[PDB]
């Protein structure tokens, strides 16, 4: 008794369905990877700790 | 009435009467199997379906 309108709210989304709008046109692709958000790290230590 | 010249047109064929021509000679065999026609399968899926 999950009543699949609640699946569209509460269950995770799989990966195998995706559209790729490339500029102004949609192009069919098989894979799409590397869409990360990465930062660098700045550190500073003194003698007091 | 089935008039056996019609049996030679529209009835199926049994498997006990066969001649094996082996190169340029006839050789009597008891069994014969494995004369298959098999293909492989190419598949391709995109994200649109």
Q: Gaps (C–N > 2.5 Å) in chain B: which residues precede them?
A: none
State whether residue B44 sits within 8 Å of chain A by CB: yes
State whether residue A14 sits within 8 Å of chain B by CB: no
Tokens of A13: 């989304």
Tokens of B29: 């065999």
User: How close A15 gets to chain B, by Cα (Å)?
Assistant: 9
State whether residue B42 sits within 8 Å of chain A by CB: no
Q: Are B47 and A18 in contact (CB under 8 A)?
A: yes
Chain A hits for B46, CB-CB cut-off 8 Å, are: 28-30
Is B48's CB within 8 Å of A28's CB?
yes
Taken in order A34, A39, A40, A45, is the CA torsion positive or negative? negative
Q: Are B3 and B10 in contact (CB under 8 A)?
A: no
Tokens of B40: 């492989």
Q: What is the rounded distance in angstroms from the CA atom of residue B20 to the CA atom of residue B26?
A: 6
Is A28's CB within 8 Å of B47's CB?
yes
């Amino acid at each position: 008794a999950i009543t699949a309108d609640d699946i569209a709210v509460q269950y995770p989304i799989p990966t195998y369905r995706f559209i790729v709008t490339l500029g102004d046109e949609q192009v069919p692709f098989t894979s799409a990877s590397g869409l990360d958000i990465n930062f660098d790290t700045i550190e500073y230590r003194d003698g007091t700790g």
